[PDB]
Amino acid sequence: GTSAENLTAAESRIRDTDMAAEMMAFTKNNILTQAAQSMLAQANQQPQGVLQLLQ
Amino acid sequence: GTSAENLTAAESRIRDTDMAAEMMAFTKNNILTQAAQSMLAQANQQPQGVLQLLQ
C-alpha cells in the first residue's frame, strides 16, 4: 500500500497537469489571438491609396 | 508497570499529535488556499487591454 501510494504520487506529478498554469496559458493565448485579429483587421485596411488616382 | 506507563507517556508526547493544533493549521491553510484561488482568478482577468485596439 505504501509503495503504491508513493508511485501514484510520482506518476501524478509526472503526467497529470496543473489546472491553474494551463488556465493562465490559455487566457494569455486567447488575449494574444484577439490582439492579432485586431492587428490584421487594421493591416487589411492600411493599403488604401485610391485617393491618389481619383478625386 | 510503572516504567512502562511512564515511557508510554513520553513516547506519546514525542510522536503522537495534538488534534486541536493540526485542526487549526488545516483550517488556516484551507482559508489561505481559497484566498489564493480568488486572487488568481482576479489576476487572470487583470490583463485585458483589448479596448486599446478595437472599438
Side-chain angles (χ1 to χ4, degrees), chain A residues 1 11 19 34-35 44 54:
Chain A
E11 194 261 308
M19 290 277 128
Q34 297 161 18
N44 263 311
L54 61 85

Side-chain angles (χ1 to χ4, degrees), chain A residues 33-49:
Chain A
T33 314
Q34 297 161 18
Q37 266 153 19
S38 304
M39 288 288 110
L40 185 57
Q42 279 159 10
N44 263 311
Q45 302 291 323
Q46 179 161 0
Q48 276 170 352

Side-chain angles (χ1 to χ4, degrees), chain A residues 17-33, chain B residues 36-48:
Chain A
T17 195
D18 200 313
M19 290 277 128
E22 304 298 341
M23 205 75 241
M24 285 198 274
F26 180 53
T27 318
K28 176 175 83 75
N29 288 113
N30 300 336
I31 287 152
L32 275 153
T33 314
Chain B
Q37 266 153 19
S38 304
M39 288 288 110
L40 185 57
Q42 279 159 10
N44 263 311
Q45 302 291 323
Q46 179 161 0
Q48 276 170 352

